[PDB]
Structures are given as structure tokens and as C-alpha cells.
Amino acid sequence: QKPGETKEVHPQLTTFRCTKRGGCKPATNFIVLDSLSHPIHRAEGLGPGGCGDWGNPPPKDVCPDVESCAKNCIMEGIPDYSQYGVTTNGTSLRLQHILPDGRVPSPRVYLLDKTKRRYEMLHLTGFEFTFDVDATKLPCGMNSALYLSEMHPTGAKSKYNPGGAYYGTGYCDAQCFVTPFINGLGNIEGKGSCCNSMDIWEANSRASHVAPHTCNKKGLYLCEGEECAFEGVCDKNGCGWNNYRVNVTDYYGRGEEFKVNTLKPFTVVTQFLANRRGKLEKIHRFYVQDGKVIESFYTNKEGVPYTNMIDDEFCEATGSRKYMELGATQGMGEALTRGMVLAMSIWWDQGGNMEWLDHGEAGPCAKGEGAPSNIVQVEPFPEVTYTNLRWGEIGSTY
Numbered sequence: 001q002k003p004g005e006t007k008e009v010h011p012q013l014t015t016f017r018c019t020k021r022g023g024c025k026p027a028t029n030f031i032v033l034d035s036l037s038h039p040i041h042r043a044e045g046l047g048p049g050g051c052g053d054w055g056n057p058p059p060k061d062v063c064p065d066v067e068s069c070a071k072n073c074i075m076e077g078i079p080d081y082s083q084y085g086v087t088t089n090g091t092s093l094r095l096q097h098i099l100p101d102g103r104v105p106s107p108r109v110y111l112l113d114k115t116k117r118r119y120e121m122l123h124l125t126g127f128e129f130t131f132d133v134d135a136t137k138l139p140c141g142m143n144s145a146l147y148l149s150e151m152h153p154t155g156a157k158s159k160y161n162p163g164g165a166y167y168g169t170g171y172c173d174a175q176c177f178v179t180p181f182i183n184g185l186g187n188i189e190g191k192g193s194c195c196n197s198m199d200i201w202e203a204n205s206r207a208s209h210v211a212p213h214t215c216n217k218k219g220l221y222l223c224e225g226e227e228c229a230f231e232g233v234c235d236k237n238g239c240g241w242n243n244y245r246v247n248v249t250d251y252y253g254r255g256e257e258f259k260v261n262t263l264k265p266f267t268v269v270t271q272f273l274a275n276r277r278g279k280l281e282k283i284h285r286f287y288v289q290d291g292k293v294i295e296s297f298y299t300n301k302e303g304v305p306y307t308n309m310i311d312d313e314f315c316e317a318t319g320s321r322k323y324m325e326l327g328a329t330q331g332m333g334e335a336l337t338r339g340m341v342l343a344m345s346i347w348w349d350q351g352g353n354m355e356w357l358d359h360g361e362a363g364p365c366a367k368g369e370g371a372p373s374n375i376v377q378v379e380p381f382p383e384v385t386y387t388n389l390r391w392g393e394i395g396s397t398y
């Protein structure tokens with residue numbers, strides 16, 4: 001969509017690049033909301049309304065073709081990101097799901113480089129990524145997410161998408177969802193927006209999940225028909241790693257009886273361990289809290305390989321079939337090596353209560369507990385804060 005007259009004022013966020021010799025050194029980055037979360041309206045004289053809702057192609061009245069859509073649909077800059085529940089303070093990023101006035105912005109943002117016109121491209125195979133988090137205000141059913149998608153570095157800036165990454169264009173993920181614009185272009189045929197996604201963190205105060213999701217296509221792929229479905233180009237389920245799912249119940253939760261006590265802030269370390277020929281072999285998650293390293297649990301479940309890291313043996317044995325079919329850990333690593341964009345978000349699930357995250361095999365939450373209608377009775381204003389985003393040499397971030 002065509003950028004409007006309103007100014008885009010990106011929150012600044014300091015992050016770090018780390019080595020063993022030099023420690024963690026500060027870097028300036030910026031934060032951008034998803035393009036379609038910006039106000040979208042029509043060109044002068046065309047009346048009120050937007051240019052389509054999530055799940056749909058854009059409307060034919062204004063978007064009969066890409067060229068027309070590009071001139072008839074206007075995307076405004078956001079001059080005050082706090083209106084969308086997005087604020088920064090030095091090295092901290094705060095995402096508010098619900099604002100005091102009752103708006104539910106459910107923000108999703110990306111990390112821009114210091115120029116504001118290209119995403120910061122992270123290349124994590126053979127390196128580690130770490131952050132600090134406050135998960136206290138995330139009850140059952142909430143998903144705070146910090147993850148990587150293989151988006152185009154300028155958001156596919158082009159003739160009909162002059163806005164590009166500066167306006168947060170180009171989002172994709174392993175679910176291949178239909179959005180009315182893809183790569184900043186009207187999605188006239190209602191294709192899905194697919195790409196590899198590495199879910200470093202999907203969590204709340206009750207459960208913590210890690211999952212690589214492979215696709216058999218590089219970068220953003222516009223899928224049609226069955227390509228967008230379960231047996232298609234992308235791994236919807238992912239290879240999930242959650243202590244509960246592997247029969248470890250005392251590792252992560254609200255209180256002193258858990259190794260990682262989510263009533264207090266903590267540090268989250270993720271290492272992407274490569275084999276001698278440079279390909280990804282294992283993903284290793286551990287934590288730090290109150291100045292003490294908390295090593296990963298090992299799996300503790302009959303029929304599950306004994307391991308403290310995600311790898312192909314584990315993913316195969318736990319039934320992560322599309323993960324394996326669409327590239328396995330090497331394939332995930334190949335995407336990581338090419339480079340990926342960092343996305344951070346907070347969201348809930350009206351259809352399914354986020355049960356896969358924290359209910360049943362995945363956590364302590366009861367049936368119905370994670371419904372949005374209940375979430376607000378438990379925590380009226382869910383939020384997350386991510387602090388001191390930092391990446392670099394193995395061993396150097398913590």
C-alpha cells in the first residue's frame with residue numbers, strides 16, 4: 001500500500017553483539033509494527049474503509065489488480081507507537097496486549113537496522129541469541145513470542161511497495177496465512193505467505209516452548225491451494241520442545257518450586273550448534289536467574305530419546321513429520337545461515353485457547369482456562385517485556 005502523509009516514528013532499541021574477547025557491545029536498532037497493523041485506508045474521494053481483513057484478498061472495488069491497489073490503498077505512518085502497546089526504554093521493549101482503555105492491539109513488531117530501511121538480518125547458525133524477559137503478566141492462553149522468519153531484508157521494497165521495511169512490509173511465517181497484502185503488494189489471488197520460521201520463544205508464565213519450523217522453499221513463497229495446507233510447503237506444527245511434553249514438571253512455572261521461577265525476571269539463552277561442516281545439528285536452550293545458570297532439563301519420557309537438545313533424532317521420534325520432510329535441522333540451519341528477521345509479538349487464541357502451549361501434554365492450564373474471556377478475568381492487561389537482546393559467540397552472551 002502507498003505510504004500516507006503521517007510520519008512513522010520508530011521506537012529505538014539498544015541491543016548487543018557479543019564475543020568472548022570483547023563481551024557484549026551496544027548497537028542501535030529500531031522497532032517497526034507490521035505493515036497491516038498501520039492504519040490502512042483508501043485514496044482521496046474513495047470513501048471510508050480499509051483494503052481488506054486478515055485471511056482474505058483485498059477488495060476488488062479498489063484492488064482489481066496490483067497496480068490499482070498500490071494507488072488506491074494508503075498506509076499511514078504511526079507517530080506514537082504507545083497507541084499500539086509498543087514502547088521502548090533503552091534496552092527494554094514492552095509489548096502490551098490490552099491497553100487501559102480496552103483496545104487490544106496485540107502488537108507484532110520487527111527489528112530494523114540502524115538505517116530504518118532494512119531489517120536487521122540475524123545469521124545464527126553456529127552462534128547464540130539471548131534475552132532477558134518478564135513473563136509475570138502472561139497467564140494461561142497468552143503467547144509472548146520472539147522468533148525469526150525468512151522475510152526479505154527490505155520488506156521487498158519495489159515500485160508498487162515504496163514503503164518496504166520502514167513500514168514493516170513483507171511478513172511471512174510457516175503457517176502460510178492469507179493476508180490482503182504480501183510483500184507490500186495487493187494479494188489479488190488470495191495466496192498464502194509462507195516462509196521458514198525459527199520459534200526461539202513462545203511462552204507465558206506457565207509454559208515455555210521452542211520450535212523450528214521448516215519449509216521446502218527459500219524466503220517468502222506465495223502458496224496456492226494444497227501448497228498452503230498441512231501436506232504443503234511449510235511445517236505448521238514445528239518440532240516442539242517443552243519440558244511438560246517430555247515429562248518434566250518442575251522446571252518452569254510460577255513459584256520457588258520451579259527451577260525457572262516465572263514470578264521473577266530471567267534470562268533465556270538459545271545456542272544453534274553446528275557440526276564440523278557448518279550445518280546446524282542441535283538447538284540448546286538454558287536459562288539464567290538470580291545470577292545462576294539453570295541448565296536445560298533432559299527428556300524424561302518413555303519412547304522419547306534421552307536428550308537435552310533439539311535434534312533430528314528427537315524430532316523424528318516425537319512425530320514431527322513435516323519438520324523432517326521439509327528440511328530437518330540442516331534445512332532450518334540453512335535458512336538461519338542465509339539470514340532471518342527478528343519478530344516479537346503478544347497474542348491470544350479465540351479458537352483454540354492456545355492449548356498446544358500450556359494445556360494437557362504442554363502444561364498445567366485447565367480446559368477453558370486459556371480462553372480470552374477468562375484471560376481478562378485473571379490478568380486484565382497482559383504484557384511482556386524483552387530486555388538486553390544480544391547475540392554472538394557461543395558462551396559470550398551470559
Ligand SMILES: OC[C@H]1O[C@@H](O[C@H]2[C@H](O)[C@@H](O)[C@@H](O)O[C@@H]2CO)[C@H](O)[C@@H](O)[C@@H]1O
Nearest residue numbers: 108145147173174175197199202345347
Ligand atoms: O496465529 C496468529 C499469530 O501468529 C503469530 O506468529 C506465529 C506464527 O504464525 C507461527 O508459524 C510460529 O512461527 O509462531 C509465531 C509466533 O507465535 C504472530 O506473531 C501473531 O501476531 C499472530 O496473531
Ligand SMILES: OC[C@H]1O[C@@H](O[C@H]2[C@H](O)[C@@H](O)[C@H](O)O[C@@H]2CO)[C@H](O)[C@@H](O)[C@@H]1O
Nearest residue numbers: 175199202211236237238240352356357
Ligand atoms: O497457528 C497456531 C499455532 O499452531 C501451533 O501448532 C499446534 C497446532 O495449532 C495444533 O493443532 C497441533 O495439534 O499442535 C501443534 C503443536 O504441535 C504452532 O506450533 C504455533 O507456532 C502456531 O502459532
Ligand SMILES: *[C@@H]1O[C@H](CO)[C@@H](O)[C@H](O)[C@H]1NC(C)=O
Nearest residue numbers: 246247248249300301302303
Ligand atoms: C514421568 O516422570 C516420572 C518422574 O520422573 C517417572 O516416574 C515416570 O515413569 C515418567 N513417565 C513416563 C511415561 O516416562
